[PDB]
Amino acid sequence: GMVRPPSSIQQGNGQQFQYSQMTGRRKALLIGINYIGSKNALRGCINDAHNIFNYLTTYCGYRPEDIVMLTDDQREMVKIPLKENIIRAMQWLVKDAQPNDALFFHYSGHGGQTKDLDGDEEDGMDDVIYPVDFESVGPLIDDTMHDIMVKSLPQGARLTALFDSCHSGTVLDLPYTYSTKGVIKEPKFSPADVIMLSGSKADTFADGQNIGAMSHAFISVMTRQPQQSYLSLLQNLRNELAGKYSQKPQLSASHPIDVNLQFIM
Ligand SMILES: [Mg+2]
Ligand SMILES: [Mg+2]
Ligand SMILES: [Mg+2]
Numbered sequence: 001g002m003v004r005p006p007s008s009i010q011q012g013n014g015q016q017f018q019y020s021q022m023t024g025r026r027k028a029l030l031i032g033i034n035y036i037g038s039k040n041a042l043r044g045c046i047n048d049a050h051n052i053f054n055y056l057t058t059y060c061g062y063r064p065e066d067i068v069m070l071t072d073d074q075r076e077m078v079k080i081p082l083k084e085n086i087i088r089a090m091q092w093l094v095k096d097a098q099p100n101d102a103l104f105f106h107y108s109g110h111g112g113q114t115k116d117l118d119g120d121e122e123d124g125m126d127d128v129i130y131p132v133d134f135e136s137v138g139p140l141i142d143d144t145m146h147d148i149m150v151k152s153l154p155q156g157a158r159l160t161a162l163f164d165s166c167h168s169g170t171v172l173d174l175p176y177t178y179s180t181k182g183v184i185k186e187p188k189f190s191p192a193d194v195i196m197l198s199g200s201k202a203d204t205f206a207d208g209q210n211i212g213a214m215s216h217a218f219i220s221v222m223t224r225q226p227q228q229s230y231l232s233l234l235q236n237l238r239n240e241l242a243g244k245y246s247q248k249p250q251l252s253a254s255h256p257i258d259v260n261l262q263f264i265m
Contacts, residue, residue: 083137
């Protein structure tokens with residue numbers, strides 16, 4: 001059998017944190033932006049969000065009324081991934097979060113860094129996503145995403161964030177990153193259970209071909225073999241991406257992870 005994550009509060013590296021048991025509420029926010037008709041148009045991001053929608057509702061018990069999907073092919077304004085709609089949807093996603101909830105966030109679109117002009121550090125950069133209206137309202141930055149989606153969460157609430165944009169863990173101010181090689185990044189800590197999956201690589205605008213590889217690989221890995229440890233998830237993602245893309249899978253987290261534990265969805 002598998003080893004499920006422990007249910008007691010954990011101490012690790014001067015941090016208290018709790019793994020989600022994934023027995024709580026299942027809500028998801030899925031964002032696919034093709035920037036349709038613009039010079040930064042992409043072709044597959046909306047499809048990426050639909051593919052994650054189908055995976056979550058078919059295999060993970062998510063109900064359609066519990067998923068907000070924002071894609072820019074929509075004629076209804078409230079379904080468009082405008083910055084203000086993304087912010088309101090991120091607030092919806094975490095409202096009411098409890099320990100053991102299973103919240104899901106997916107972003108497929110452009111990503112990069114912008115100068116952190118108020119940041120009390122020269123050459124300091126914000127890590128950002130690009131809402132469809134970014135040419136008129138700017139990006140949505142790490143600080144905001146972290147403040148809405150992470151800082152709010154109770155101990156033991158899961159947020160599983162899947163980025164198709166090749167962000168690093170800095171996009172959600174996560175202190176830990178794991179690869180198939182082990183710990184590749186480690187240290188205001190959260191006790192929640194925030195994990196992030198993303199590929200290693202204003203940096204997507206000329207490299208749009210690596211966008212979308214992670215959700216495709218994730219769905220493929222999890223469909224072929226639903227039983228995964230965090231270790232095998234990263235190995236199987238690595239195997240799924242190795243030829244077709246240069247990006248490598250990276251698991252970022254708000255807390256240390258014993259990779260031998262089961263990765264529960
Ligand atoms: Mg700033
Ligand atoms: Mg930052
Ligand atoms: Mg694609």
